[PDB]
Design a protein around this ligand. Sequence first.
Ligand SMILES: O=P(O)(O)[C@@H](CCCc1cccc(Oc2ccccc2)c1)S(=O)(=O)O
Ligand SMILES: [Mg+2]
Ligand SMILES: [Mg+2]
Length: 284
Amino acid sequence: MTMMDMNFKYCHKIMKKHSKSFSYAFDLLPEDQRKAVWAIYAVCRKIDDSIDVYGDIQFLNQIKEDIQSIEKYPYEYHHFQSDRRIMMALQHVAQHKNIAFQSFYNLIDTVYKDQHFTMFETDAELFGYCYGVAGTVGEVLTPILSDHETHQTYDVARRLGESLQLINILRDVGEDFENERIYFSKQRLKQYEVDIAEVYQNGVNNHYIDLWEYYAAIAEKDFRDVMDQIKVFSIEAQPIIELAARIYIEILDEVRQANYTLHERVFVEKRKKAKLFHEINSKY
Ligand SMILES: O=P(O)(O)[C@@H](CCCc1cccc(Oc2ccccc2)c1)S(=O)(=O)O
Ligand SMILES: [Mg+2]
Ligand SMILES: [Mg+2]
């Protein structure tokens, strides 16, 4: 095992831990491609967690710098300020694949704002946040999971990304509330006459469930739309992307089964991930 492999293994390790779902799906891709996904995932994870758990903008600048460093000089050795392994893997990926640096930049700009947090007045802002945090990830991943990096492919990957993030938010209401963050908009929170702090105490109700379903409705609709357009992705990527998405979208049924709980992070047992893997691999 060469050292560069060591760095990719560290990226994988990170992905395995923070996302059993995506890890479960993407590891099915051929070597060169999953390596690229591990690295890109690790980068994003460091960004996200350098603020959603280690709330530290200093690091975030360390990472933002390393990347600009790579974009600027893909073929020079750098003494990265944040996490050498991940950057080395990313830099290695970039010397082979096209990378949308601006996309990592939008994510960064985005998780920054998650410092002095302020609710969203409208779903539009909610939706734009889904873009900066996920749509942009779909955009960085596009050159990796596709052959035709065209407007249509970027646009689908992006929507996939935004949809997967809406589901993400649909599961984490409680977790997010404990952390002092509500992502449903006030417009929509008022319209449905619901208070998160109040539901958190006395439990769900129908105001919440309806509201929760309003969003789920959206998420699922966009999910179906992207599945239709799944062929914009490579043949090998298609089933994996589908499993990644169905494995993630299944989370909605899990929030339901647990009665929209605000005190647990529901999940999809690895055995169901296997079941879904099954129902899809037939089709392929
Ligand atoms: O918006 P949130 O609630 O912080 C959400 C993370 C969003 C940022 C993020 C983190 C890690 C990976 C990621 O993008 C991916 C997703 C799949 C594969 C590779 C990268 C996006 S999390 O709930 O999983 O932490
Ligand atoms: Mg987070
Ligand atoms: Mg979340």
